[PDB]
């Protein structure tokens, strides 16, 4: 996250860190029940050096605050049993960029490990609304990742505006969230993590999943996120959640 700040410990207890074997933190995810995480499909596609689609290649860390302290009290390490990537996911456009990760053994809920609520299909996150991205991704464009989880406040952008800021790249499954002025954005290593939204009454819903962007924090180039409300039934169908 560029232009953010350190999270308070336990502030985002649904944020998960996904490490690939021999590589450390690669992607974020979010805890939606004791057994299931939500992440981005593009994180789990093989490349020439490594089978990212193979659930055996991954370790999830729940309750993690600091990447240098993976054995801190409250950190929970879990293997993955299964990766369900959305069947319509397109590798080129990142349309339908969502995946569900099944833990081999369940999360134990605590001060540091708690699920985030899923929005119904009808749930509106209006243009202009301040919401949050979190992650251990790069903190400056051209820079490096964070040891301490970062949070950034960004605003939902109108879909027509989003479509024309990134011409011929935006589908109805996507949302732009950020600023026309740049400054605050997700960045490399934030992929798969949650967009968290606080409602007027204080309830927190997951609005989206960090998907892609043209650079980070640049003018007229807000980060792109998978809209979660559209996937409510699909999540229920595949997980029971």
């Amino acid at each position: 996250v560029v232009g953010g700040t350190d999270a308070d410990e336990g502030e985002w207890p649904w944020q998960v860190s996904l490490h690939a074997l021999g590589q450390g933190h690669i992607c974020g995810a979010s805890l939606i029940s004791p057994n299931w995480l939500v992440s981005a499909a593009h994180c789990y596609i093989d490349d020439r050096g490594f089978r990212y689609s193979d659930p055996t290649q991954w370790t999830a860390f729940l309750g993690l605050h600091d990447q240098s302290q993976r054995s801190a009290p409250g950190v929970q390490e879990r293997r993955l049993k299964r990766i369900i990537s959305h069947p319509f996911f397109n590798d080129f456009t990142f349309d339908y960029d969502i995946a569900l990760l099944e833990l081999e053994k369940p999360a134990e809920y605590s001060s540091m490990v708690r699920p985030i609520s899923l929005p119904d299909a009808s749930h509106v996150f209006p243009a202009g609304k301040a919401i949050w991205v979190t992650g251990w991704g790069h903190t400056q464009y051209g820079g490096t990742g964070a040891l301490i989880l970062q949070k950034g406040e960004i605003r939902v952008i109108n879909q027509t505006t989003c479509e024309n800021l990134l011409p011929q790249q935006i589908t109805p499954r996507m949302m732009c969230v950020g600023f026309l002025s740049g400054g605050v954005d997700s960045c490399q290593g934030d992929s798969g993590g949650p967009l968290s939204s606080v409602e007027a009454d204080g309830r927190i819903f997951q609005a989206g999943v960090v998907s892609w962007g043209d650079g980070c924090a640049q003018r007229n180039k807000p980060g792109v996120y998978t809209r979660l409300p559209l996937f409510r039934d699909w999540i229920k169908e595949n997980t029971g959640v």
Partner: antibody
């Protein structure tokens, strides 16, 4: 496994044009870009590139004007045409396939991982 | 305009570093990659995004960046590392290479 195979060496009279091709052996460019780089003996020089499936060419300033870069996903072949050839254009021209065009927030032209074998263009009469 | 020393030397086993000096519009604002070119061979990507090593690149290669400079370190160099090494960065809307550094192995 990906392999890019380039067209044969050419000899071109100064002032002529050359069009070098670069075929992706697997029949598809998939979600990757093609970048063109030459080695004229002084060091590597970026010429430009294009995403073949989503094609609008990007060019290096030095070669703006004289270079045209195209690509056809159906024949999985990319092309670089260099016109008004100079003696100093005597070089080995490489095409290279980049990383995935959307996986890295930093982009792709700086991530050239699969290289063609090079095409020698000798500019001489 | 990325500047590299034209020549660096080290003996087998030695650690050597190869510097790439740029400006705000390139290295200062962007990630740096590094490439090796062995004689008579197409270039090979060693490092991207400042310090990331693709699979099939020897562990002895590493990268760093600070401000408007970047460095490739070859730790434990061997006789077969005799080659030219190039840094690469975006510069505004184009990509640029450093002038290249030839590694001489000391004997």
């Amino acid at each position: 496994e990906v392999q890019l195979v380039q067209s044969g060496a050419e000899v071109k009279k100064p002032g002529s044009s050359v069009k070098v091709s670069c075929k992706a052996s697997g029949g598809t460019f998939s979600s990757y870009a093609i970048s063109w780089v030459r080695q004229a003996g002084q060091g590597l020089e970026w010429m430009g590139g294009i995403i073949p499936i989503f094609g609008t060419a990007n060019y290096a300033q030095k070669f703006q004007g004289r270079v045209t870069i195209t690509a056809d996903e159906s024949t999985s072949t990319a092309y670089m045409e260099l016109s008004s050839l100079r003696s100093e254009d005597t070089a080995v021209y490489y095409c290279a396939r980049t990383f995935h065009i959307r996986r890295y927030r930093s982009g792709y032209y700086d991530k050239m991982d699969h290289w063609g074998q090079g095409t020698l263009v000798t500019v001489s009469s | 305009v990325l500047t590299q020393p034209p020549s660096v030397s080290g003996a087998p086993g030695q650690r050597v570093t190869i510097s790439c000096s740029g400006s705000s519009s390139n290295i200062g604002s962007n990630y740096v990659s590094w490439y090796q070119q062995k004689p008579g061979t197409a270039p090979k990507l060693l490092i991207y995004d400042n310090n990331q090593r693709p699979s099939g690149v020897p562990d002895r290669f590493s990268g760093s960046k600070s401000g408007t400079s970047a460095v490739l370190a070859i730790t434990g160099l061997q006789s077969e590392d005799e080659a030219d090494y190039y840094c690469q960065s975006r510069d505004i809307s184009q990509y640029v290479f450093g002038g290249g550094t030839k590694l001489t192995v000391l004997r």
